[PDB]
Design a protein around this ligand. Structure first.
Ligand SMILES: [Zn+2]
Length: 198
C-alpha cells in the first residue's frame, strides 16, 4: 500500500462502514465494455467494504476514459482522477480490477520494498526509458507476504526491449508464474480489507 500516515491518500469510509468510490464512464465505452467494468466492480463488492458508485456531486471521483493504455493514479489524488481503459487493449475484468486497485492505494507487487528476496530484475532486457516501472517504491506491506499471484504483479516479459525477453525472473524458483490478470488474489483482497478496516 501507499504510505500516508494521516490517511488523506485513501478514500473515506461512511457511517455505514462503506467506502464509496464515485466514478464516471466516458460515453465512448460500449454496452459490452460497461458489462466488463461491472464485472470488475462486482469482485470488490463481493469481498470488501468498497463500493464503486455512480458519481453525483462528489468532488473526488474516478473518470474512466479511453486514453492511450491501461492506467490509474495510486490512491485518492483529489478532484477528478483518470482511470484509462483503452478500448483496444484494456477492457477486461482483471485489467479493470488492477487499475481500480491502484486507485484504492496499491502499487505493483514487484515494487515492494522486499521484492529483491522474490524476483530478479533483468535490467538489460527492459526497453529503453522503461526501467522506472521496475523501481522499488515506498511500500507499506501491511504485514502480508509477497504474492507472486497478485493481480498487481508484472509478468515475466513486461516492457521487454525485444519480444519475449524476460525482464523479471522469480527467485529461487524461476518457474513460478507471475502476471495473472484473471482477478484480485486472496492476498490482494486481504490488503484492501486491512487498509480500509472493513
Ligand atoms: Zn498497474
Amino acid at each position: 500500500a501507499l504510505i500516508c500516515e494521516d490517511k488523506s491518500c485513501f478514500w473515506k469510509k461512511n457511517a455505514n462502514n462503506i467506502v464509496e468510490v464515485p466514478y464516471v464512464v466516458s460515453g465512448e465505452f460500449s454496452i459490452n465494455d460497461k458489462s466488463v467494468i461491472a464485472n470488475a466492480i462486482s469482485i470488490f463488492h463481493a469481498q470488501t467494504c468498497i463500493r464503486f458508485v455512480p458519481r453525483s456531486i462528489q468532488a473526488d471521483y474516478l473518470s474512466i476514459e479511453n486514453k492511450d493504455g491501461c492506467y490509474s493514479a495510486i490512491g485518492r489524488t483529489g478532484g477528478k482522477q483518470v482511470v484509462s481503459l483503452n478500448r483496444k487493449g484494456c477492457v477486461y475484468s482483471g485489467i479493470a480490477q488492477h487499475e481500480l486497485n491502484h486507485a484504492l492505494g496499491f502499487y505493483h507487487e514487484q515494487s515492494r520494498s522486499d521484492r529483491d528476496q522474490y524476483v530478479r530484475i533483468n535490467w538489460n532486457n527492459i526497453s529503453p526509458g522503461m526501467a522506472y516501472n521496475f523501481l522499488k517504491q515506498k511500500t507499506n506491506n501491511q504485514n502480508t507476504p509477497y504474492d507472486y499471484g497478485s493481480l498487481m504483479h508484472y509478468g515475466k516479459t513486461a516492457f521487454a526491449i525485444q519480444p519475449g525477453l524476460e525482464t523479471i525472473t522469480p527467485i529461487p524458483d524461476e518457474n513460478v508464474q507471475i502476471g495473472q490478470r484473471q482477478g484480485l488474489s486472496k492476498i490482494d483482497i486481504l490488503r484492501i480489507n486491512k487498509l480500509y478496516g472493513c
